């Protein structure tokens, strides 16, 4: 087929979007692999955009935008949320609002790609999934001050976890209670998407199911490794993903 140079450039840009996501989000990339090619590549573009903004390729993004009639709002929301705050979060609501504006927004970005019909019925599930995934990522690595800053001071106070403990990266009972209190919320969002799993079209169910299983597994691994998130960034290995996804 004589493809236009423009389309050739779009295909190149998409592949690069896939290289990116595959590198910075192996688990999600794996979950997305179950989508048909058109949807899969579109998802790469959306998440590549997220990664890029969190730290040309627009050709593939515009293509995805026009192909799936994506909405501009969530993309704007995500961008605005990258302007930060060097101050620690106070309320759990503050952390949740943040996960909502980033992960939740990403979930909304992807909605039109995950489903063509029952979008109204699956919107809540998509946002909850993205929100939960962001919470899981947050709970998987507390190595820097920026990450430590997202731990809600009111939650820390509830269990007696001190600023001094946190700065030292001390993993004591007070810390695990703080961590589990936040993990409880993440799991509630996950279960919410789990309940709506049968509503997604067959072409995207394996992708949603994979995402759900993978992130639940991440939380379990962290627990298995004694919540040692101040020292290591937790992620599933290729071997682990394979087992989780064996079905």
Topology:
Blueprint (H helix, E strand, L loop, with lengths): L4 H20 L1 H7 L4 H17 L4 H11 L3 H11 L9 H23 L4 H21 L5 H4 L4 H7 L3 H6 L4 H23 L6 H23 L13 H8 L2
Quick recap of the structure?
It is classed as transferase. Helices cover 73% and strands 0% of the residues.
What is the chain-wise order of helices and strands?
HHHHHHHHHHHHH
What's the level 1 CATH class?
Mainly Alpha
**Structure classification:** mainly alpha
Radius of gyration: 19 Å
The CATH architecture = Orthogonal Bundle
PDB class: transferase
Keywords: Biofilm, DXXXD motif, squalene synthase
Assembly: monomeric
Entry title: The crystal structure of YisP from Bacillus subtilis subsp. subtilis strain 168
Tell me about this structure.
The longest helix is centred in the middle third of the chain and has 23 residues, at 92-114. The protein has one domain (1-247): Orthogonal Bundle (Farnesyl Diphosphate Synthase). It has helices spanning 5-24, 26-32, 37-53, 58-68, 72-82, 92-114, 119-139, 145-148, 153-159, 163-168, 173-195, 202-224, 238-245. 40% of the residues are buried. The chain is mainly alpha-helical. The chain is globular. It contains 13 helices and no strands. This is Farnesyl diphosphate phosphatase YisP. Keywords: Hydrolase.
């Amino acid at each position: 087929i004589h493809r236009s140079e423009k389309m050739k450039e779009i295909k190149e840009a998409y592949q690069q979007c896939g290289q990116i996501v595959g590198e910075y989000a192996p688990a999600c990339f794996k979950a997305l692999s179950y989508l048909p090619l058109k949807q899969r590549q579109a998802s790469w573009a959306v998440l590549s955009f997220c990664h890029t903004a969190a730290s040309h390729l627009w050709k593939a993004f515009d293509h995805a935008y026009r192909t799936f009639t994506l909405e501009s709002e969530p993309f704007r929301e995500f961008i605005a949320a990258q302007k930060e705050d060097a101050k620690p979060y106070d309320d759990l609501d503050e952390l949740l609002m943040y996960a909502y504006r980033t992960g939740g927004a990403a979930g909304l970005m992807l909605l039109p790609i995950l489903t063509r019909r029952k979008q109204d019925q699956l919107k809540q599930a998509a946002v909850s999934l993205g929100l939960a995934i962001q919470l899981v990522r947050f709970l998987s690595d507390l190595g820097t001050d920026q990450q430590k800053n997202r731990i809600p001071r009111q939650v820390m106070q509830q269990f007696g976890y001190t600023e001094a403990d946190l700065q030292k990266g001390t993993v004591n009972k007070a810390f695990t209670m703080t961590w589990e209190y936040i993990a409880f919320e993440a799991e509630a969002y996950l279960e919410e998407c789990q309940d709506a799993l049968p509503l997604f079209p067959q072409y995207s169910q394996k992708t949603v199911k994979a995402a759900l299983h993978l992130h639940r597994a991440v939380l379990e691994k962290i627990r298995a490794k004694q919540h040692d998130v101040f020292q290591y960034h937790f992620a599933l290995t290729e071997t682990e993903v394979k087992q989780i996804l064996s079905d």
